[PDB]
Design a protein around this ligand. Structure first.
Ligand SMILES: Nc1ncnc2c1ncn2[C@@H]1O[C@H](CSCC[C@H](N)C(=O)O)[C@@H](O)[C@H]1O
Ligand SMILES: Nc1ncnc2c1ncn2[C@@H]1O[C@H](CSCC[C@H](N)C(=O)O)[C@@H](O)[C@H]1O
Ligand SMILES: N[C@@H](Cc1ccc(O)cc1)C(=O)O
Ligand SMILES: N[C@@H](Cc1ccc(O)cc1)C(=O)O
Lengths: 378, 361
């Protein structure tokens, strides 16, 4: 395994045993600090691009990158301990190198590059995380007391959106399998709305899966520019378009067969979330679906599965950057009901869940009239 | 258990599938940032002390700590997701609390408290880690160009030493078993020298195991004070002494049956390490042992075990704070030989190895 503690050497019976064992486990969690520090320093120094160009021992890489030889040995061996880089052995020793899969993740400009995540950490998240205590003290509530949506800004997303492309393929595969099993097909026309599309990868992969479909991505102008470039890269530009502007305005159009919200709801407040859900219902075809892809957990907020654990942690990442949450199934169901929609599927993905919702079929149990309206206003 | 990625849902072996899997695995390693941030913020806010005093729902704890109620729920549920705090969920809602073992680790002033580690990260390590690239560029070198020893200062050790007490019990029990299997018994007297003793816990646990032994700890003034107070709490004060000051000034003594270096050699340069080893040999009694407890790896520097993997990372933690290393078995053997010592044993512990050496002549 990749454990940093040999737990076979820790006992666990007495009160002291158990305190010592817990302390080792907490220490292992604390030194998780070191991995982003090592990986992001290596990015700043040019290590990954250099190894991809020419595998080298630590002294040669230090020469090429104008670094100290011993410190570079320390850095590269740490990356090796994290399984981030590999070794190739010669008759006289070894060189460090990147596997093909690691190259895709670590170099700039690739489809699944994490560089935008490295830069988001360096520029935004690292300094924020050290100030977490002050943000918990004060909250995300504005001066008037109202909560704020998440504070990651468009200039920050210019780096970050490409750094989260890696999430998309498993999600789109799972979504497409369900769409096909429920009767959808790529040989008939259909329209997708991708709200806050980022690079557009989710709808672009859908376009590749369903060759007669079209997609419209909503985002701010500087991100829409990225999305159109990526649509061309993936060969789907004839069926992908963007509409720039603030998606909270609504008026998204008509007749959409699928409205996708990937990594959007966690940025919202409850008020902004229900408004978005209402905009989605307003633009949906009669038989259309809304797909929510997010960090979603039951109201019990128990860390049972990896997706549950990640969701609980992701809520802290949202608080760290100024607002949002990891919302519960029951909160999404409130919002679906408020928008005249009904959840019909929940699907697991590596770090997310997908909720699918359709237009509701049955009426409220309270009939139309002033009593219903007073309940609505309250 | 700990995983944040459902790897069962990352399938296939096409080039794309492998790249996506790797990206998820690298992302999971990057978000390890979040755990110390959550834990250390909770410490700063007084969360652990408040939960120990009275379990609480999140809204009550927010009122007690003058924090935002929703943000407190988020923080507490993250701590629960990390298995750091406990939480009961019943028809009355959620209540957060500490287990007995977590209380020992998370509150100040306990024997195994990690508070000193929290404070070391907040005050020293976290700002340094953000600047790691600069130290790699320039090297852990002094103005003359020579390798520098680690830079953590004595005032920083005043917090940190109590925060690493948790390492000691597994190490001392392993060491004690090997000393007893080596004919060293209770009821026979022996003298221990604990070089850079920190809180003195390694010595003090040996004193509890071997009731006729005595131990002398070498450390700086303010840490010797901590070590004596802890010996008193552990009931071994009559057999534990300290010799306060820079151990490079000497005044170590002679006739020691055991000379212990726990978490010392990784702070050294090769030049300072060989000098320390020679000093140790000179103070040994006949049949005395030197015990090195450290992050030790083969020269191949392969992460074949947890201890090897941790050692390679610990070398980066040393570089981060200005010098030192995780040295190799081969380097220790060179230093032993230069000092007239010979390695006789290597013992594994949860995050370290123990090397034992004795005089060859
Ligand atoms: N009010 C708003 N109007 C338009 N775009 C917005 C917005 N608030 C957030 N966004 C966009 O929403 C995106 C959130 S990041 C998620 C991007 C993409 N859906 C993916 O999952 O990879 C960013 O691209 C950001 O620019
Ligand atoms: N030159 C020196 N003289 C005296 N003490 C020193 C020293 N250099 C380092 N130390 C001490 O060495 C210790 C390193 S931390 C390890 C402490 C203890 N052996 C443990 O393993 O828990 C600190 O207490 C520090 O103050
Ligand atoms: N919080 C994530 C980044 C992120 C932000 C917004 C999103 O919509 C998605 C991902 C991180 O720091 O790793
Ligand atoms: N480098 C360790 C702390 C440490 C420092 C010096 C030591 O001798 C031992 C431990 C950490 O940051 O977790």
């Amino acid at each position: 395994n990749v454990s940093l503690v040999d737990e076979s050497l820790l006992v666990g019976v007495t009160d002291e045993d158990r305190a010592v064992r817990s302390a080792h486990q907490f220490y292992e969690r604390l030194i998780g600090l070191w991995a982003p520090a090592v990986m992001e320093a290596a990015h700043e120094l040019g290590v990954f691009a250099a190894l991809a160009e020419a595998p080298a021992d630590s002294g040669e890489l230090a020469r090429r990158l104008d670094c100290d030889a011993r410190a570079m040995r320390v850095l590269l061996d740490a990356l090796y301990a994290y399984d981030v880089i590999d070794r190739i052995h010669d008759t006289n020793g070894f060189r460090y190198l990147l596997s093909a899969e690691a190259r895709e993740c670590l170099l700039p400009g690739t489809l699944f590059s994490l560089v935008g995540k490295f830069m988001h950490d360096i520029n935004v998240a690292w300094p924020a995380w050290r100030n977490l205590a002050e943000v918990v003290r004060h909250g995300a509530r504005d001066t008037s007391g109202a909560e704020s949506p998440n504070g990651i800004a468009q200039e920050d997303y210019e780096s970050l959106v490409g750094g989260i492309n890696f999430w998309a393929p498993p999600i789109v595969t799972t979504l497409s399998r369900k769409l096909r099993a429920s009767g959808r097909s790529g040989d008939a026309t259909a329209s997708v709305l991708d709200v806050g599309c980022g690079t557009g990868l989710y709808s672009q992969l859908l376009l590749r899966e369903f060759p007669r479909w079209t997609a419209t991505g909503l985002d701010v102008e500087r991100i829409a520019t990225l999305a159109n470039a990526q649509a061309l890269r993936l060969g789907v530009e004839e069926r992908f378009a963007t509409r720039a502007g603030d998606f909270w305005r609504g008026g998204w159009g008509t007749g959409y067969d699928l409205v996708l919200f990937a990594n959007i709801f966690h940025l919202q407040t409850p008020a902004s979330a229900v408004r978005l859900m209402r905009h989605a219902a307003a633009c949906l075809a009669p038989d259309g679906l809304v797909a929510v892809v997010d960090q979603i957990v039951d109201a019990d907020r128990e860390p049972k599965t990896p997706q549950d654990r990640f969701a609980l942690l992701f809520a802290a990442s949202m608080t760290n950057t100024g607002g949002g949450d990891a919302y519960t199934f029951q909160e999404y169901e409130e919002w679906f009901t408020a928008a005249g929609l009904q959840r019909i599927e929940t699907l697991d993905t590596p770090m997310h869940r997908i909720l699918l919702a359709r237009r509701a079929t049955e009426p409220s149990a309270v009939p139309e009239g002033q009593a219903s309206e007073n309940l609505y206003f309250q």
